[PDB]
Design a protein around this ligand. Structure first.
Ligand code: CLA
Ligand code: CLA
Ligand code: CLA
Ligand code: CLA
Ligand SMILES: CCCCCCCCCCCCCCCCCC(=O)OC[C@H](CO[C@@H]1O[C@H](CO)[C@H](O)[C@H](O)[C@H]1O)OC(=O)CCCCCCCCCCCCCCCCC
Ligand SMILES: CCCCCCCCCCCCCCCCCC(=O)OC[C@H](CO[C@@H]1O[C@H](CO)[C@H](O)[C@H](O)[C@H]1O)OC(=O)CCCCCCCCCCCCCCCCC
Ligand SMILES: CCCCCCCCCCCCCCCC(=O)OC[C@H](COP(=O)(O)OC[C@@H](O)CO)OC(=O)CCCCCCCCCCCCCCC
Ligand SMILES: CCCCCCCCCCCCCCCC(=O)OC[C@H](COP(=O)(O)OC[C@@H](O)CO)OC(=O)CCCCCCCCCCCCCCC
Ligand SMILES: CCCCCCCCCCCCCCCC(=O)OC[C@H](COP(=O)(O)OC[C@@H](O)CO)OC(=O)CCCCCCCCCCCCCCC
Ligand SMILES: CC1=C(/C=C/C(C)=C/C=C/C(C)=C/C=C/C=C(C)/C=C/C=C(C)/C=C/C2=C(C)CCCC2(C)C)C(C)(C)CCC1
Ligand SMILES: CC1=C(/C=C/C(C)=C/C=C/C(C)=C/C=C/C=C(C)/C=C/C=C(C)/C=C/C2=C(C)CCCC2(C)C)C(C)(C)CCC1
Ligand SMILES: CC1=C(/C=C/C(C)=C/C=C/C(C)=C/C=C/C=C(C)/C=C/C=C(C)/C=C/C2=C(C)CCCC2(C)C)C(C)(C)CCC1
Lengths: 27, 31, 480, 38, 337, 69, 34, 32, 19, 31, 75, 54, 34, 31
């Protein structure tokens, strides 16, 4: 599950952080 | 009158009457 | 004020920076090709090329390099299990390294064009405003493409200057990289003829040059210029997308149905070869001929090479995997080592029995032992079910001819029942499921994964063609 | 180059866009995690 | 003369034809009409003829027609036999060789409806593009019609193309579609597929939006240019009942477009996977637990057993070309567990 | 806005190519020739599809894995 | 795992170079008054 | 040689052109 | 030697961007 | 360990629901 | 032309009244005379299981199919 | 022959569920206070009736 | 568990009382206009 | 099951920390 766990983790961190950065810059 | 409207209506109605006659006669077919 | 989905529209009216983003994309694609090629070399196992080919190892990019004539590696091993005396500059490691170097070089060229965006080249001499002569530009690029198409099929494929391409035995037994003589008659249009590839690229390339020259000299008619909105650059995008997804479908179909450009020895056997018993018919034809020579039945089966018998196996079927059964084929049912030999079943009174092979549709198929005529004789009850023709009651026996266990015979119902289940799967093999902790569930070969990937992209790109086509034709209303 | 691009703009997404984005990411993860884990 | 751009040029027979095609009548022919109308007429005509007269005795071994005594729920235009592989089954082709009677018998009338129908769908999409241009509107309607086109292509063309033949495409009938629907569950476990799960949400979510918008607009009307309902009251009502509510008319009426279109596009991607038997059939983790532990059982394990029942019992007649004969002792049964 | 961009040695060589943007021919031009080639190409594509589909059997071709022999 | 080592070295060296160049980019302290 | 399938294919090519030709003339006739 | 190669690559990249 | 992963993802989705209900965004003009 | 005009028109009714019923009967005779059973190849009730074959038919052939369908069918 | 549907008993989100009440209960009202013991209440699918009713 | 039953019966009956008495407290609908 | 409880409590404490850091309370007067 090492590859399964990391895939889930990255799919959360990478997009969510990207969205948050844009929102901060907008405001 | 032979405009497009005539062709469109007769292109659907004419076969429909034929089929309806085919189906109605086709209820009574002895099994 | 740009929504998150229009952030890239800033380069619509900026040819200088348009070249930059296109350069950056090309750098990313090249970087992937080199990185993926390097990844596969670190995992490829070139020990056994008969029972453990590269399509059995989940290698996606490696087959494409080998298709055009790269066989040796700097590690001293050849794809065919040779010694690789003279790897040369062009080896798997070299080509992968070459792409990365090119990937980096494009990255630098991307930064330069991004910074220096305002160039006199992109400015109309008549008026200082930026402009692009799309009808003429297409002439230059098409002219270049025609030359490459002719160059590829006249030198690289024919062997005049290049190595050639991978040609193979109809049954994928003997394969190698050989020059291809162009075929010019109607015989050159059938898919499975390598001569077509050489002939096509010569003819298509020549016509590409003539058309490229034409589009330079002859300007578009005023009617078409405005009907097709040749002034805008969207029209080039929408039309280009249309051509791309047309190519994706053709490549997807040619890969799924097999062709001269996708040899089974290189990408894996086709699904339709198992449905029609392509290899089974060949094996039987070979065996019967040996029997007619007066040879024994035991040695006749031993004459069949293990490569041929390893294709007659439902596990080597692209249409048996799962969407989330990730990984290489070997991770499904272990590593194929050794062939146990043809299995012959006989009942007590003498008649031989045949096991009904599993249709490619079914994932769980009942085990049926059919008589020569076709009437079911022996069975395997579903489970803990009352039986009238189970193995014990009819007491069938299994004998192995050829292969590892040639000449042996078994009668224990437990052992016969075990080999009956393996018989419906095709030829019987011995698998090492401990090296990779194989699960036991069939995966899909690179032929299956390539087809799935490119048909999905083909549909998605159809929507893109519609969307970008809609914006072009309706430019005034969308713009304002 | 000294001259800036006349056609230079700034991306921007409001809070509603953030909430849709976060919900889409998490809901997709909820649906597909079982299959990825397998 | 006609003013193309700044300059004006002498008209041509093309211009004369365009004027007549775009002439405003009851039926807007347009340029696309030259492709939609002939093809759509035969797609409808083919199905009606096929259901009324043509039979499926020689392809599927069934009796699918009114003439053989079938209802509207049972009549269908059945797909050709599996032995036809992926032949296009032209009436002049090497199979029928121009013999109409045996062209229908071989099942070629299915290909007639599917191919002509497929080009009818193209014609309709183009027509939507043309009318929008004629009225100067953004053609969002045409873009929203891509979803049904994607579904049709995925299911009736891409799927059978990846299988052994046309024999396994849906047959144009009411009951025959139900057979197709059950076929996927038994063989493909289509319900458990993630992409169908994302298509069911779109279709059920779309019907949710249709009901609320109709109910909200019709209950917030003003008493009797200017809108007829109070956007303020509707926003206040839902924000306090549900928790969130729309506040932009453009966003609301674009959301209703996005939910159904995206729903069917995801399901279409799933059927592409099934075209290659690339199924999301099972969870390996649970299969191992059940096998080693006979007392372990989940609702997923129970489903897998049901699929085994569908395959074994229906396969005998659903796929005659395999000549399968399953003795009663090997057919799955519940009491045998 | 009006000042030209960089005067590059490469750029001045390539100006002739990107110089006559917007030029067109009066009338329909070569569109008639266009139509012939599309029809020939459409006819060509049908031939290979039917050959590959096995709906058009020729004497020279074989259309099977055995032709590699 | 050579890939992991290369990735980690790249990240570390990138960050260290950023640190060094950032502390170089500052200008010396001085007192505007007096 | 000319296989039977080829003859029919050429005939279909003629037949398809004939169908298109009828439509093209029909539009011009009604338009004029 | 992975260290040396990585450092040479990162330094060259930065310098090349500037030049 | 999987049960931990599933539960966090389910709770994460619920957390976003709470934010959207209460920490809304004031309407802009024109909208 | 307006719908009322044709509906009230005398010429419309006289021509339709004499051709529509003929068309309906033409459909009736098409099935009654058994012609439909022949053109479309649909077997009549009795010739479903011939003497040679007593089970459901099956093609198992592609290029010879036309010849084979002759044998399976009762002609 | 119990059926396990908890997330802590080797189930995913897709396979997990709250199993309905037992067949032996039938249509009888089954609150917590009528069960012999809490384990008996759980073993007979008690929480399903509680959830559906509320 | 008699203690649990008594607690629930009290919570259930309490809330129902608010529901019943809540709708009584409302005054009848009337139209100020016309 | 205890692991879920412990993890949830830790995550709740971290969430409170995050709220206190970012969703801070504007100062009043006099204070
Ligand atoms: C079309 C292109 C293509 C194709 C056909 C393949 C095919 C293959 N690859 Mg390659 N690969 C590709 C692109 C491609 N890859 C790219 C672009 C990358 C860079 C990331 C890789 C990186 C890569 C690695 C590192 C490895 C492979 C491996 C493999 C093989 C195993 C099967 C597989 O991929 O798992 C099947 C997996 C899937 C089908 C993924 C699910 C995708 C669905 C559609 C979900 C989509 C995402 C969803 C919307 C959100 C996810 C939510 C989140 C919680 C997960 C197979 C031969 C493996 C192998 O065995 O090679 C030795 C391997 O180790 N590939
Ligand atoms: C080569 C093909 C091509 C090119 C050059 C473009 C270029 C463009 N498109 Mg088009 N488009 C394409 C294919 C293409 N698209 C396809 C195939 C589709 C169907 C899905 C669309 C659907 C589409 C829509 C619906 C819209 C555009 C828009 C745009 C413009 C802005 C880009 C954008 O959305 O912001 C950049 C986008 C992002 C930052 C979001 C990225 C999110 C993705 C999904 C995640 C990353 C995925 C992965 C890393 C990369 C996938 C690789 C795969 C292709 C192999 C730009 C002119 C927009 C526009 O200007 O119209 C007014 C717009 O509204 N396009
Ligand atoms: C759903 C299908 C569909 C739809 C709605 C559109 C819609 C559009 N396309 Mg696209 N296109 C499609 C499919 C589609 N296309 C396909 C499959 C291709 C081939 C790859 C293209 C290639 C293409 C190009 C190259 C261009 C367009 C353009 C356009 C736009 C203008 C219309 C046009 O050029 O005529 C569309 C014409 C057709 C779809 C052909 C009509 C049907 C033919 C004549 C029937 C032939 C049947 C024949 C007997 C074959 C039988 C097959 C049998 C053997 C199986 C519009 C947005 C243009 C554009 O964007 O300009 C701004 C443009 O330049 N399209
Ligand atoms: C625009 C309307 C339209 C469209 C798009 C189609 C499309 C199609 N029809 Mg339909 N059909 C139509 C109208 C249409 N038809 C009409 C009006 C009739 C009544 C007569 C039929 C009757 C019909 C039957 C009975 C059958 C079809 C079939 C087909 C399919 C095969 C096409 C094919 O190979 O034919 C030929 C296509 C072409 C020749 C393409 C044109 C290419 C160019 C014009 C060739 C030009 C070459 C050259 C210049 C001309 C020769 C020059 C020489 C004289 C010197 C395809 C899906 C067949 C099928 O698949 O059924 C399952 C089939 O059996 N159609
Ligand atoms: C998010 C990333 C994807 C999920 C990763 C899950 C995972 O654990 O993978 C795990 C796998 C690797 O998996 C491991 O591989 C090993 C190789 O030696 C062994 O086989 C192991 O047994 C195996 O577990 O990672 C991948 O294969 C990535 C593949 C990426 C997908 C390529 C094919 C794409 C085809 C469809 C493309 C179009 C789709 C359009 C959709 C719209
Ligand atoms: C988006 C597009 C929207 C518009 C589309 C409108 C419909 C277009 C008209 C219908 C097109 C019909 C094409 C028929 C192709 C055909 O008959 O293939 C059948 C043949 C292959 O034929 C097969 O060959 C095999 C060889 O081992 C076996 O012998 C099989 O038995 C045999 O059937 O393929 C082709 O002729 C064309 C291949 C290239 C095109 C591929 C299309 C996509 C394929 C997807 C594959 C599954 C994933
Ligand atoms: C490898 C490098 C990394 C790659 C990954 C990068 C990923 C980047 C993020 C991509 C996603 C962005 C999403 C934006 C999300 C967003 O904010 O969009 C907002 C957008 C509308 O915004 P407007 O155009 O009105 O906003 C104007 C500006 O203010 C910009 O927002 O809506 C859409 O276009 C579709 C959105 C997706 C569809 C949303 C609804 C359906 C999905 C939710 C379903 C929930 C489940 C329901 C059933 C249970
Ligand atoms: C007492 C009743 C309590 C009910 C509690 C439930 C409330 C649900 C609140 C849903 C908020 C969803 C996020 C909206 C994000 C958001 O802020 O949207 C805001 C949006 C309004 O946006 P505007 O009109 O201001 O947009 C202006 C434009 O310029 C775009 O920004 O609301 C909607 O469109 C309605 C969408 C409802 C969608 C419902 C989806 C439900 C999915 C549920 C998934 C649950 C999974 C559970 C897993 C265990
Ligand atoms: C131009 C069409 C003129 C009207 C033909 C009659 C229409 C009614 C057909 C009713 C079904 C009977 C069929 C018999 C057909 C028949 O008997 O063919 C006969 C002919 C030669 O066949 P043989 O002589 O080998 O047949 C011998 C047998 O009849 C006895 O052994 O076939 C052809 O050459 C091609 C025929 C094309 C017929 C279809 C034309 C339409 C093609 C589609 C064009 C689409 C163009 C799209 C462009 C965008
Ligand atoms: C600069 C340079 C250099 C170097 C360079 C390098 C080293 C580079 C690298 C590069 C690289 C290393 C790159 C990479 C890339 C990658 C990519 C680009 C990827 C992508 C991916 C994708 C896109 C994915 C997708 C997906 C997934 C995730 C799965 C499935 C689904 C999909 C398909 C969506 C040197 C110093 C030598 C010199 C000078 C130049
Ligand atoms: C195939 C063919 C073709 C063509 C064809 C066509 C074109 C057809 C058409 C057809 C048609 C066009 C048909 C129609 C039909 C119709 C019908 C069949 C109807 C029915 C109706 C009904 C059934 C109704 C019912 C109802 C109502 C609505 C009223 C009262 C109530 C009820 C519900 C009872 C071609 C030439 C290509 C080739 C040869 C052959
Ligand atoms: C013939 C041949 C071939 C091919 C080759 C090739 C294709 C090459 C290419 C190459 C290339 C493709 C190159 C490129 C390069 C580029 C570069 C080298 C760039 C540069 C840039 C720069 C250096 C920039 C800089 C800058 C920046 C970064 C920013 C600011 C400052 C400036 C702007 C100055 C083959 C394969 C067959 C093999 C071998 C032989």
């Amino acid at each position: 599950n090492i590859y399964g766990l990391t895939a889930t983790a990255l799919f959360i961190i990478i997009p969510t952080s990207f969205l948050l950065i844009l929102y901060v810059k907008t405001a | 009158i032979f405009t497009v409207r005539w062709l469109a209506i007769h292109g659907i109605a004419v076969p429909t009457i034929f089929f309806l006659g085919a189906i109605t006669a086709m209820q009574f077919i002895q099994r | 004020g740009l929504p998150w989905y229009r952030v890239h529209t800033v380069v619509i009216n900026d040819p200088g920076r348009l070249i930059s983003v296109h350069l950056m994309h090309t750098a990313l694609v090249s970087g992937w090709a080199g990185s993926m090629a390097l990844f596969e070399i670190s995992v490829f196992d070139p020990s056994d090329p008969v029972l453990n080919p590269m399509w059995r190892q989940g290698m996606f990019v490696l087959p494409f390099m080998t298709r055009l004539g790269i066989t040796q590696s700097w590690g001293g091993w050849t794809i065919s299990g040779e010694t690789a005396t003279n790897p040369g500059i062009w080896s798997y490691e070299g080509v992968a390294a070459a792409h990365i170097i090119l990937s980096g070089a494009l990255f630098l060229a991307s930064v330069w064009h991004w910074t220096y965006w305002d160039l006199e080249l992109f400015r109309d001499p008549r008026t200082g405003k930026t402009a692009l002569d799309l009808p003429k530009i297409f002439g230059i690029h098409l002219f270049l493409s025609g030359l490459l198409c002719f160059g590829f099929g006249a030198f690289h494929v024919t062997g005049v200057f290049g190595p050639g391409i991978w040609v193979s035995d109809p049954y994928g037994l003997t394969g190698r990289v050989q020059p291809v003589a162009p075929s010019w008659g109607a015989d050159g249009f059938d898919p499975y003829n390598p001569g077509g590839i050489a002939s096509h690229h010569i003819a298509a390339g020549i016509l590409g040059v003539l058309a490229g020259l034409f589009h330079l000299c002859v300007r578009p008619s005023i009617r078409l210029y405005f009907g097709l909105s040749m002034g805008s650059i969207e029209t080039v995008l929408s039309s280009s997308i249309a051509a791309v997804f047309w190519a994706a479908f053709v490549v997807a179909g040619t890969m799924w149905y097999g062709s001269a450009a996708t040899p089974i020895e290189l990408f894996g056997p086709t699904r339709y070869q198992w449905d029609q018993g392509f290899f089974q018919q060949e094996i039987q034809k070979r065996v019967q001929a040996s029997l007619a020579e007066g040879a024994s039945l035991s040695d006749a089966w031993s004459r069949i090479p293990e490569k041929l018998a390893f294709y007659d196996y439902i596990g080597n079927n692209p249409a048996k995997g799962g969407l989330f059964r990730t990984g290489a084929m070997n991770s499904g049912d272990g590593i194929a080592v050794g062939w146990l030999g043809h299995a012959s079943f006989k009942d007590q009174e003498g008649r031989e029995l045949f096991v009904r092979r599993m249709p490619t549709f079914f994932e769980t198929f009942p085990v049926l032992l059919l008589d020569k005529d076709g009437i079911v004789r022996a069975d395997v009850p579903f489970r803990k079910a009352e039986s009238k023709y189970s193995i014990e009651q009819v007491g069938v026996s299994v004998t192995f001819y050829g292969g590892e266990l040639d000449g042996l015979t078994f009668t224990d119902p437990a052992t016969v029942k075990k080999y009956a289940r393996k018989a419906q799967l095709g030829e019987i093999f011995e698998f090492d499921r401990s090296t990779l902790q194989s699960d036991g569930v069939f995966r899909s070969s690179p032929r299956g994964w390539f087809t799935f990937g490119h048909v999905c992209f083909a549909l998605l790109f159809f929507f893109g063609h519609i969307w970008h086509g809609a914006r072009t034709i309706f430019r005034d209303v969308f713009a304002g | 180059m000294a001259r800036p691009n006349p056609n230079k703009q700034v991306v921007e997404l409001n809070r509603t866009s953030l909430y849709w984005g976060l919900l889409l990411i998490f809901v997709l993860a909820v649906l597909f995690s079982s299959y990825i884990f397998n | 003369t006609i003013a193309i751009g700044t300059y004006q040029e002498k008209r041509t027979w093309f211009d004369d034809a365009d004027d007549w095609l775009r002439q405003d009548r009851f039926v807007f022919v347009g340029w696309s009409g030259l492709l939609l109308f002939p093809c759509a007429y035969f797609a409808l005509g083919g199905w009606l003829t096929g259901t009324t007269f043509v039979t499926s005795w020689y392809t599927h071994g069934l009796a699918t027609s009114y003439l053989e005594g079938c209802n509207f729920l049972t009549a269908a235009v059945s797909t050709p036999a599996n032995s036809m592989a992926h032949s296009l089954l032209f009436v002049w082709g090497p199979e029928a060789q121009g013999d109409f009677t045996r062209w229908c018998q071989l099942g070629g009338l299915w290909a007639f409806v599917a191919l002509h129908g497929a080009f009818g769908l193209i014609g309709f999409m183009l027509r939507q593009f043309e009318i929008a241009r004629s009225v100067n509107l953004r053609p969002y309607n045409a873009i929203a019609f891509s979803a049904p086109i994607a579904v049709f292509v995925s299911v009736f063309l891409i799927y059978p193309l990846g299988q052994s033949g046309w024999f396994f495409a849906p047959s144009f009938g009411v009951a025959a579609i139900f057979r197709f629907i059950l076929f996927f569950q038994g063989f493909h476990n289509w319900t458990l597929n993630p992409f169908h799960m994302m298509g069911v949400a779109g279709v059920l979510g779309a019907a949710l939006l249709c009901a609320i918008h109709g109910a909200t607009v019709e209950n917030t009307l003003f008493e009797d240019a200017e809108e007829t309902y109070s956007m303020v009251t509707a926003n206040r009502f839902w924000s306090q009942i549900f928790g969130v509510a729309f506040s932009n008319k453009r966003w609301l009426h674009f959301f209703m477009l996005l939910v159904p279109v995206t729903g069917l596009w995801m399901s279409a991607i799933g059927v592409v996977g099934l075209a290659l038997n690339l199924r999301a059939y099972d969870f390996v983790s649970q299969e191992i637990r059940a096998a080693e532990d006979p007392e372990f059982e989940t609702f997923y394990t129970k489903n897998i057993l049901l699929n085994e029942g569908i395959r074994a019992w229906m396969a005998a007649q659903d796929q005659p070309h395999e000549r399968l004969v399953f003795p009663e002792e090997v057919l799955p049964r519940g009491n045998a567990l | 806005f009006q000042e030209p961009g960089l005067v590059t040695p490469l750029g001045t060589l390539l100006r002739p190519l990107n110089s006559e943007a917007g030029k067109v021919l009066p009338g329909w031009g070569t569109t008639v020739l266009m139509a012939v080639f599309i029809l020939l190409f459409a006819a060509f594509l049908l031939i290979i599809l039917e050959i590959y589909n096995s709906s058009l059997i020729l004497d020279d071709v074989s259309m099977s894995w055995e032709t590699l022999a | 795992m050579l890939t992991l080592k290369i990735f980690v070295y790249t990240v570390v060296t990138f960050f260290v170079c950023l640190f060094i160049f950032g502390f170089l980019s500052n200008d010396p302290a001085r007192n505007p008054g007096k | 040689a000319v296989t039977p399938s080829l003859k029919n294919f050429l005939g279909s090519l003629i037949a398809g052109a004939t169908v298109l030709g009828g439509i093209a003339l029909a539009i011009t006739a009604v338009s004029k | 030697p992975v260290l040396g190669w990585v450092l040479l690559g990162v330094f060259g990249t930065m310098w090349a961007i500037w030049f | 360990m999987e049960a931990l992963v599933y539960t966090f993802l389910l709770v994460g989705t619920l957390g976003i629901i709470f934010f959207s209900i209460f920490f809304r965004d004031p309407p802009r003009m024109i909208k | 032309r307006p719908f009322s005009d044709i509906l009230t028109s005398i010429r419309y009714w006289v021509i339709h009244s004499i051709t529509v019923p003929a068309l309906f009967i033409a459909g009736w005779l098409f099935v009654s005379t058994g012609l439909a059973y022949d053109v479309f190849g649909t077997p009549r009730p009795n010739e479903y299981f011939t003497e040679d074959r007593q089970e459901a038919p099956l093609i198992t052939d592609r290029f010879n199919a036309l010849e084979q369908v002759k044998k399976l069918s009762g002609n | 022959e119990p059926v396990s549907g908890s997330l802590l008993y080797g189930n995913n989100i897709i396979t997990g569920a709250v199993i309905p009440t037992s067949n032996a209960i039938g249509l009888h009202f089954y609150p917590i206070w009528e069960a012999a013991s809490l384990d008996e209440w759980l073993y007979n699918g008690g929480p399903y009736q509680l959830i559906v009713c509320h």
